[PDB]
Amino acid sequence: NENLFASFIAPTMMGLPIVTLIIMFPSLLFPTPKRLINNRTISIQQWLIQLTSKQMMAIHNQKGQTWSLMLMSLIMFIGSTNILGLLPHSFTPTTQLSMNLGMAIPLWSATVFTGFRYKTKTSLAHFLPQGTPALLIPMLVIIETISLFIQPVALAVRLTANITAGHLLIHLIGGATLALLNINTMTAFITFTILILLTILEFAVALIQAYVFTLLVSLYLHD
Amino acid sequence: IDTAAKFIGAGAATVGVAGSGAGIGTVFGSMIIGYARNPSLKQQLFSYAILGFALSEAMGLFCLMVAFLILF
Amino acid sequence: QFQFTGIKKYFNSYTLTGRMNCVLATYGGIALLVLYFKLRSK
């Protein structure tokens, strides 16, 4: 009975203040120069794109490369709006589940209607995998279609659910420091747990690779 | 009456993460034996450690999503 | 605006399939209604 942890009971509030300012604000962090040589703070933004434009280009190699100049705009928005919110009292728009159901469905259904305007038969004859055995036709095409319509829900809900899960352990491990007016040795160890956990919460960049990329595979496979 | 049922339905919901507590244990133990064979770590071998980590934590944390909704 | 003709060659290329927010719009309208419905019955 040496080190008694404490807790504080307080509501954890994802309120909704004025959003249409907060969305526009990580656009003005990135400038664009009309010059040949630039000014050594855009120049490391301009290099960072020319890496990861050479990995969502290499797989496709089609005349579906026209689509890929948009997919690098999709990575900078939720790459920024997940990285701004680590600050003391900032607010992330990708916390709320509303816009992510408007980021999945106008993009996911832009893929199944891409081959249906050109191929019209073999896009969803990709439901036929192989040299058909007899015992498992109805066990297959009720499975590979129930794992198609999961994909818009599978794409949005994986983003909202772990981003907000980062924010609660920021509060709760952090709030247990404030309410630790018992023995002062254990206060540092909870603080040292925080400054490790904030390094893990720069996997909010790592979770945007797993949103543009499984949009490519959900584009490359259909087209 | 359902005040306990608020608890155990949350108290049982949390142990569904116990897969992904081991599922990332595979992908980091399985990387060092993919690395000691072939020391080219700056290539795409380390890039398949994080996407395997992120796709496993994507199925990791949202099991705790159903935990809070039963509470709150 | 001139937020158009810089990207107007891009739009009618891919908005043939990309500007199908009708499904998104339809879902949104329904979502607002259900919330109202449950607050109507409280």
């Binding site: 249409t20 656009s27 990135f30 928005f77 728009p93 509303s98 816009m99 | - | 990207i7 607002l32």
Partner: peptide, 30 residues
């Protein structure tokens, strides 16, 4: 929290994809 009602943010997301297609469109060649 479990927020509600959704008439908000999603109309303020597609105005943003007039911005990001304006900046990133003026990039250069290696």
């Amino acid at each position: 929290d479990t927020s509600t009602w959704f008439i908000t943010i999603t109309s303020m997301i597609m105005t943003l994809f007039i911005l990001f297609q304006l900046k990133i469109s003026n990039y250069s060649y290696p």
